[PDB]
Design a protein around this ligand. Structure first.
Ligand SMILES: C[C@@H]1Cc2nc(NCc3ccc(Br)cc3)[nH]c(=O)c2CN1Cc1cccc(C#N)c1
Ligand SMILES: C[C@@H]1Cc2nc(NCc3ccc(Br)cc3)[nH]c(=O)c2CN1Cc1cccc(C#N)c1
Ligand SMILES: C[C@@H]1Cc2nc(NCc3ccc(Br)cc3)[nH]c(=O)c2CN1Cc1cccc(C#N)c1
Ligand SMILES: C[C@@H]1Cc2nc(NCc3ccc(Br)cc3)[nH]c(=O)c2CN1Cc1cccc(C#N)c1
Ligand SMILES: C[C@@H]1Cc2nc(NCc3ccc(Br)cc3)[nH]c(=O)c2CN1Cc1cccc(C#N)c1
Ligand SMILES: C[C@@H]1Cc2nc(NCc3ccc(Br)cc3)[nH]c(=O)c2CN1Cc1cccc(C#N)c1
Ligand SMILES: C[C@@H]1Cc2nc(NCc3ccc(Br)cc3)[nH]c(=O)c2CN1Cc1cccc(C#N)c1
Ligand SMILES: C[C@@H]1Cc2nc(NCc3ccc(Br)cc3)[nH]c(=O)c2CN1Cc1cccc(C#N)c1
Ligand SMILES: C[C@@H]1Cc2nc(NCc3ccc(Br)cc3)[nH]c(=O)c2CN1Cc1cccc(C#N)c1
Ligand SMILES: C[C@@H]1Cc2nc(NCc3ccc(Br)cc3)[nH]c(=O)c2CN1Cc1cccc(C#N)c1
Lengths: 174, 174, 174, 174, 174, 174, 174, 174, 174, 174
């Protein structure tokens, strides 16, 4: 994490590009940082888009739900880019983007299995996650449950036709 | 924790927005930090409100009681925002907010079970918590005990009708 | 631990409000820090009061005795504020405050039990604690020993009746 | 890691010479840093080349594939310099360089074995790697699968004739 | 590691004397740092010499080969000074210096045993080291193999007559 | 564990008195041993009763369910004696006793909270536990769910009137 | 594990009842023991059946395949009994039983997900498992794959109608 | 633990003298062993007494209560002998002995402080302990609670005066 | 590991069936035990065959070579049965069996990759392994080197075609 | 620990010579063992002497007091032999022997410092030790306190003239 050039860090100038990247497992600290960055970008401008690079092997369910609630709260359109992999919570945040701005890369893998203590609490968490999926991906609850029951990854085109993604860019279209 | 924009980081500008975030488990250090931040915001202006983002999986009983005493001591109205999950100790602070300023998010989870060496000390602490709940939630001691005896998470609407929350917002007032 | 406001840390401005915070267990380093802060505050002003916030689950006997000797040595009046829990050494430093200026929040906890290798040394230290309590709380050595034999936490009102506290404030009296 | 010469660190000036370096094992953080550096160099100039030094013993397949997708996304030609060794996951990044600009030092070691929990996921990743190698190395899928099935290190000349490298420099052009 | 004086660290000023010290075991990070320092000194001036202090108890074979390739690539004459000892890779880098500039100290010990799990890879690396020694030391492959097969250290005079060193200085000749 | 007197061990003569014991946490090995003992006692006599002492603080749900299925399969009447305590799983084993043979000592403790990765699996297991309780205790599903939702122990008389126990002996009734 | 009755152990008499118990995770040692027990029971009598109790959360794939090959090699009919739970690797052993002798208790759990570095080898093992399941359960490979692609536990009736089980007993035949 | 002389172990013959020793902390296994020994001695003879040597630094409240219930259940009179020391549970089992047979050695130490997650559970357990003490020592609940609220050790003579002991023997009756 | 019946352990009767199972990784102790068992079976009868069950994930090269030299030294024909898998040294011992007696089960996995500090020593050992394979498998050195260079598992039929096996039995000979 | 010869262990025959060796630190287990052995030797014959070899670097105060109470309780004359050393509790048990039978060896060292949580408890225990010393050694309390306050060892002759020992033997006097 070297300093890039007014003496900005690689992750400091990154946020100055309206970009909030969620790298690694999603924990309480990472969730709080992402929420703070999203709110700061909203304060800077409530109409400009905010990019979110999603590369996480999982995380906490409550953390992802808080990040999703913050994303939906702010009035900025969220462009979710799956740069790497999209685990259960990562894939949820990916699908939680604005309709028509959920992009990805050719070798990006998406997974919605949600492998997951309090039985009733986690089951109701799964129920509300199914609800969020049915809302964003424009799908039904039965198909979402059947898909999340299978422990398997999906390709960019599969995720695009299923509703998780919208576009699959290989190079900047010009 | 990158630097945002006079060379301030996330957690510094967060406190400059009259906002305090009790993130992670509540311990002696976190409790002291929250108390200092609340008192500093009071010093800045005793009239302006203070926002408290509550996302904690639990914490210490004495720490939460100290945070509650500091909140009640300062003359600033406390807007408790349940951003994520609100454990027993965090749920107390969420209920200890100003009447009419205890907000939450759609996918937030609130718990008041308080899954809790000195048996008599922790019992008196539980009684103090019952009293605080009956005071802020405008409920009785019997119902509070019955609710805190069950290990479960309440929904935003359930916590709003029970007395823990006041409003359940999805987007800012349009 | 963010930066507050000329780019002062939270704990730095804290010491600039004549406040010393004895947080967490009391050890040699914490004791040296508290002693240095007290002496520096005396240097800044020998007549202005010094506020000592006490929240500790215990500590070292010699460390608490050093802090007490430093408090008694400096001419400044020491306002001991119990914010959280006051353990053996915490409660001892609390009772060691200037008469008429020992305060505690409504839900704070006080305990002088002192749950007491050199057996004779620690016993003589215990006798010194007995004497200090008899001096400050205006109580007799017999009742002090009888109370310290019981392992329990005193409430702010109970500690005020016992002579450990002078006031139990709920809100700034105006 | 000393400071070099306006108070620039060695790795800071390194990124300031359009020179990215995938050193050590490839993980989520390292891949995120590499992607950020690549995108920042594209922002500085989308036509000037970008140098990528590869001395990695491997890493996460997802991370390397994300780095590859980022390299292919940006319009800058990527000069992949194999320094020391180019393990499986690095070898792809070494083979993914712009044609006519993939260099390697005389004593560098190249390997594409890619030693190979979700079986279907990792095997689909292996198939994607086969496709990428066939694309960049201009080789067929059968020969790539045969070469990656053998656990061995190729020499710079061997990797050059195999299509992984374009030049094997001993000294700069005289 | 104090600061020497325009507020330069001891190692920062060391690197400003055209000097790169390979201290301790040679790992990937140390190898990358040495390569970056050598290339930076080249950029500063490709004509002035570069001093390399070699004191390491071993290291990685690929790391030493990368350092050697970097040394041979840059057009700067390398003055290798053995300060304290020279392990297998250290002694190799020592012999890899410019003819007539491979100095050492009286009590400096040189070892070329190379106590070398991919067996074929390490054996091919061993053959590469044999070739490098035969090139620089101006010796044959058989004698180099016989020497590296024995696990023992060599004195500065023995290393000078064998071809590893050129001069054995005690004090600056004036 | 001394030998008692034909040179039998404590736990050996114990099983020779048709007396099985579930001590400590219930696990795969313990459950297998209990099943083997129950089947051996059935082989010895399918009509004579079998005593099951329960002093377990819990264990695996599948193990307790295996023990329960073995108890139901064997035709022997099972006298479940709650000695010390009967945690959730043990409590099921305590409730799974033959009607009119579930005994408990005065100071014994009963608890059916069942505090408990696959969400749906554990939820269906909890549903099966609800069904088993409704069957044995002659209670409804709603009351069982309400009771098991509260994390608290029950007294012998409370468990007897609730349906978990039948008799509360202090001494052998004669 | 006390001694039962000529001073036989629990697991000793268990094997003397032509009964083998695959308890806990399946490893090399456990698989070798199961194979030895099966072959010894065959030696005793090739016509008499052999009972295999299956309570395992999984284990090594090669170990389970060795157990399956031993079961199929011996001429004795294998009566599989799912007690407690039959995880993926055990489920095969449960499904590999003789047609018409695969029993399961009411609360037992069956799972065939087979959650599974030698990527190619584990995929070929998964294909062999597909073949074995298609053979024993009298189902097509497509349905077997679509079923075990989901991570879930089947009930006794579900596994019986799917082909993994034959009978679901609650009590011995009256 | 040597063999004493029909090849008896020291503990084997010890238990053959109608003597049970609760040595060390009281856990589930120790509790089960003590219960088994007591019931075996009852089986041997219900009239003859049973000697219980108590040397424990503490233990589990549930284990001590189980041992107490077993002692009260069996008709044999229990002669409690405090050897070395008697902690909370040790002293409870000591006082639980038959009246007129609770002995202790001259230098033995008795402590009933009971220094003690479920708050309500442990509190009800402490209430049960208060009741047991009031029953056996013939003391009132108020004085019992005020006594064990202090953390101190009673001498054999003091414990005899307090009602915990009946005799303090220095030598057998001459 | 129960006892089978004149009070013989399972592994004891196993060796009494002229069988020597090399289970788990091959180490010095396991190699010594296997050699001792082979020589004991030779002493019992030099004409009767000796069965060697091979289920190993790997082992030491020297250990496997010692086992091979022992197998070749004794005049008994060695029937090597691959049960579950045959790793680097396991597969070598398997191929080292007497011609016409190397058997394997349908689902067994054979691998001769031999993924193998002394470099020259291990390379000479691997050359010896090449020679042994060429001797027993009737194959040439080049093909053996090509096969062992690939990290993959051969099926029983493939290993039979490659000369490692002579038969692939599904059931005993009818 | 070999077997000596009717197939008796070294320690078993040692205990059969009326000898109890308190070897190593004195803990609850060793204390119970010594008490049991002493009582067994009493049961065998209350007139014959009992030898006690004392070689321990310390132990527990309560354990030593229990051993002392057992020694004084039994009517057998205790011959305490100091073999190698005598720590605080070891030296106490040594002095606790019968007058005229407290022997030792030439190079045996005696220490009575007693370097010693519960301050008041250990203080009263050390007072009891003072009393025991004054009783057995025929000395006063002041001298005993002054001696135990010094952290130093004593020679056999010093301990004999002080009262701890009675004789200092080198060879059996004949
Ligand atoms: C109203 C309350 C206060 C507030 N304050 C500002 N100030 C701008 C700002 C925030 C943060 C940084 Br860093 C820098 C500048 N902007 C807002 O959007 C909010 C909203 N809050 C409600 C709310 C809603 C949903 C999720 C969360 C959460 N977590 C909180
Ligand atoms: C009177 C005593 C001193 C004092 N000092 C100031 N100065 C402002 C200030 C405080 C902190 C930072 Br950082 C920056 C500026 N402001 C106050 O509100 C208090 C109140 N204190 C009593 C008190 C009451 C309740 C909880 C606690 C606690 N813990 C302490
Ligand atoms: C006389 C000796 C020197 C001295 N020096 C100053 N200078 C002011 C100062 C101190 C510290 C910081 Br940071 C900044 C400014 N002020 C004093 O009060 C003392 C007293 N000392 C005696 C003494 C008494 C009791 C406890 C301790 C202790 N520990 C030491
Ligand atoms: C459109 C989206 C936003 C964006 N923003 C800028 N700004 C320049 C800049 C970036 C970073 C630093 Br540090 C400094 C300056 N430049 C871009 O190339 C992209 C592309 N993004 C899409 C995209 C494509 C492929 C991989 C990833 C990833 N990870 C993301
Ligand atoms: C051509 C490529 C880019 C390049 N860039 C510059 N710029 C100067 C500079 C470098 C680094 C720092 Br810090 C500061 C200033 N100078 C060069 O010598 C090289 C050579 N590279 C090829 C190359 C050859 C041998 C080993 C490695 C390696 N590892 C890489
Ligand atoms: C029919 C099958 C074979 C069998 N064999 C005997 N033999 C007596 C015996 C068993 C064990 C010892 Br040790 C000593 C003597 N007795 C039986 O009850 C059963 C029942 N089995 C079915 C079954 C039912 C429920 C749970 C499990 C389980 N786990 C297994
Ligand atoms: C022919 C070969 C030798 C042999 N020997 C006997 N003896 C009886 C016996 C075995 C074991 C104990 Br313990 C006690 C008595 N009985 C047999 O079934 C076999 C079969 N063998 C082939 C074979 C097939 C499948 C899996 C494995 C494996 N692993 C091995
Ligand atoms: C009636 C039930 C069965 C029974 N069986 C016998 N047999 C004698 C015996 C027991 C053990 C060994 Br070892 C050797 C011979 N004797 C009895 O006292 C009891 C009493 N039971 C009830 C009961 C009461 C209190 C605590 C517990 C407990 N834990 C259990
Ligand atoms: C001659 C030497 C002594 C000897 N002794 C006997 N006695 C039979 C016997 C051996 C072992 C047990 Br257990 C029980 C009975 N039988 C022999 O085969 C050998 C051969 N030895 C040479 C030799 C050759 C190859 C590998 C090794 C090895 N390791 C050793
Ligand atoms: C009266 C009570 C029962 C009793 N029983 C016998 N039986 C002989 C015997 C004991 C043990 C083995 Br092993 C073998 C044979 N002999 C006795 O001395 C005692 C004395 N007891 C009281 C007592 C006094 C002092 C310390 C402790 C202690 N700890 C206990």
């Amino acid at each position: 994490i070297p300093i890039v050039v007014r003496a900005y860090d690689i992750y400091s100038r990154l946020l100055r590009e309206r970009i909030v990247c969620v790298m690694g497992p999603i924990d309480d600290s990472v969730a709080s940082l992402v929420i703070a960055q999203l709110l700061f970008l909203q304060s800077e401008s409530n109409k400009k888009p905010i990019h979110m690079y999603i590369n996480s092997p999982g995380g906490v369910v409550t953390a992802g739900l808080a990040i999703y609630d913050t994303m939906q709260y702010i009035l900025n359109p969220i462009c979710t880019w799956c740069v790497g992999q999209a685990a259960s919570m990562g894939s949820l945040l990916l699908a939680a983007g604005t309709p028509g701005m959920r992009h990805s890369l050719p070798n990006s893998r998406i997974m919605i299995h949600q492998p997951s203590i309090q039985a009733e609490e986690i089951m109701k968490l799964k129920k509300q996650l199914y609800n969020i999926y049915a809302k964003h991906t424009k799908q039904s609850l039965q198909v979402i449950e059947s898909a999340m029951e299978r422990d398997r990854y999906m390709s960019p085109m599969e995720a695009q036709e299923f509703g998780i993604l919208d576009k699959v860019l290989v190079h900047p279209p010009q």
